[PDB]
């Protein structure tokens, strides 16, 4: 059930 949101910040 992997998350769909970004795993890293934009930088």
């Amino acid at each position, epitope marked *: *059930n992997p*998350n*769909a*949101n*970004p*795993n*890293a*910040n*934009p*930088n």
Partner: antibody, heavy 121, light 107 residues
Framework: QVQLVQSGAEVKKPGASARVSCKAS????????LHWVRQAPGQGLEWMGW????????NYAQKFLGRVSMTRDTSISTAYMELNKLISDDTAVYFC??????????????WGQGTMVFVVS | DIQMTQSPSSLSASVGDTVTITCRAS??????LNWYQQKPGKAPKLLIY???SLHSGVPSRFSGSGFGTDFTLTISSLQPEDSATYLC????????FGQGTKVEVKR
């Protein structure tokens, strides 16, 4: 300290557009996703979408697709949200808010003070 | 979208009491569950992230537990300044807030 500073209240007719600006102070805007969340009177919070301030990419909630634009001017550390075709149900406090996708697993740690948008006939 | 609900919607407890607020998600969010405190006329303040991690500055009085679709916020040793609304929020797939639980502190 670390804060987000928002513009002042908007008074708009139905069908008009509301613009809110959001200035990052004490951190680099392009280092974090920037979200917009609104809270209508007597209700819970509603996530509207995010801006990647580095790339300019966005992810809008489907409820606001076609109506919302999230942009930024990285030279003045400022993000912008515009909401078009306003209806009475858009009357709310609008917050810009940073998330930390790494350390905080997507939680929202720095919130602007909020901007009131009044849709008035 | 993932829907969030909280129970109870309101509660009242004495100073020093332990209160527990539950949060449910319409589908599993693993441990991507955050808690906020909100007082009238203010922005929410982050309390707990990743189900149980305390954000910088939050007393160990606040505790979080759970996984998947069921979560708990526990406030031990309730204090007067804890009178507020407590909100859960999933950060697994987009972001969704619960509607909040109102906490009254008896005196």
């Amino acid at each position: 300290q670390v804060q987000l500073v928002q513009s002042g209240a908007e008074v708009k007719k139905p069908g008009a557009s509301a613009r809110v600006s959001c200035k990052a102070s004490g951190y680099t805007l392009t280092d974090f996703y920037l979200h917009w969340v609104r809270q209508a009177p007597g209700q819970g919070l509603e996530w509207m979408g995010w801006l990647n301030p580095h790339s300019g990419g966005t992810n809008y909630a489907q409820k606001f697709l076609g109506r919302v634009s999230m942009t930024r001017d990285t030279s003045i550390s400022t993000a912008y949200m515009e909401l078009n075709k306003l209806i009475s149900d858009d009357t709310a406090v609008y917050f810009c808010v940073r998330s930390d996708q790494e350390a905080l697993r997507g939680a929202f740690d720095i919130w602007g003070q909020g901007t009131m948008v009044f849709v008035v006939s | 979208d993932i829907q969030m609900t909280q129970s109870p919607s309101s509660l009242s407890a004495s100073v020093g009491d332990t209160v527990t607020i539950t949060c449910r998600a319409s589908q599993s969010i693993n441990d991507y569950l955050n808690w906020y405190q909100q007082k009238p006329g203010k922005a929410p303040k982050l309390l707990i992230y990743a189900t149980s991690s305390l954000h910088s500055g939050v007393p160990s009085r606040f505790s979080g537990s759970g996984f998947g679709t069921d979560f708990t916020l526990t406030i031990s040793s309730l204090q007067p300044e804890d009178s507020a609304t407590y909100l859960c929020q999933q950060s697994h797939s987009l972001w969704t807030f619960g509607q909040g639980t109102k906490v009254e502190v008896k005196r």
